[PDB]
Design a protein around this ligand. Structure first.
Ligand SMILES: *[C@@H](CC(=O)OCC)[C@H](C[C@@H]1CCNC1=O)NC(=O)[C@@H](CC(=O)[C@@H](NC(=O)c1cc(C)on1)C(C)C)Cc1ccc(F)cc1
Length: 161
């Protein structure tokens, strides 16, 4: 049911935080489109924090979902889950131990986020946009969306804010 919140968006993915709140990666948003989920973009309030992109819709799109907690990353050392959906449909939950929160230089662009290390295949280019989630007590907490990963190593970057 939490997987039903990850949706094909552009060249990547997006996650329904609330009935009205879609989050995704800036690199993934289609730039030639004038409506998202049937709502015209003129009526959609889009806020960008580097690679973390937040789309607030005028009217709730997903009646069925409950709102989730959104926070700027997780505490250093938290083992989050990277809910990767694949274009084939397969679901790849990945464990990532999150680390330093920082503003990073990724390919000349400035990016706020949190680095993480995948624990024990890996991530690929279709995967930008998928959410990082960890359970805190009884509530799930979404902390960011996948934006990058080191060519050499396990490092994954989770765009935040
Ligand atoms: C997802 C988006 C995509 O395909 O867009 C094309 C622009 C893709 C996912 C990664 C590719 C391989 N595995 C992935 O998880 N993201 C990107 O291609 C971003 C670039 C990278 O991932 C590079 N990584 C780094 O530069 C890097 C830096 C650090 C600390 O760790 N890795 C490649 C080595 C893959 C696109 C991007 C995002 C944000 C930016 F500011 C610039 C560029």
């Amino acid at each position: 049911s939490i997987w039903s919140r990850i949706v094909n968006f552009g060249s990547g993915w997006g996650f329904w935080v609330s009935p009205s709140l879609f989050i995704t990666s800036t690199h993934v948003i289609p730039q030639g489109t004038q409506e998202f989920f049937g709502v015209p973009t003129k009526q959609i309030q889009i806020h960008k924090s580097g690679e973390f992109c937040r789309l607030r819709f005028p009217k709730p799109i997903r009646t069925d979902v409950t709102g989730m907690i959104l926070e700027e990353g997780a505490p250093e050392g938290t083992v989050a889950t990277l809910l990767i959906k694949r274009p084939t449909g397969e679901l790849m939950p990945l464990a990532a131990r999150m680390g330093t929160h920082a503003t990073m230089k990724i390919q000349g662009r400035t990016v706020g986020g949190q680095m993480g290390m995948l624990l024990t295949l890996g991530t690929t280019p279709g995967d930008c946009g998928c959410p990082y989630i960890y359970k805190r007590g009884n509530d799930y907490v979404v902390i960011g969306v996948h934006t990058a990963a080191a060519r050499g190593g396990n490092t994954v970057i989770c765009a935040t804010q």
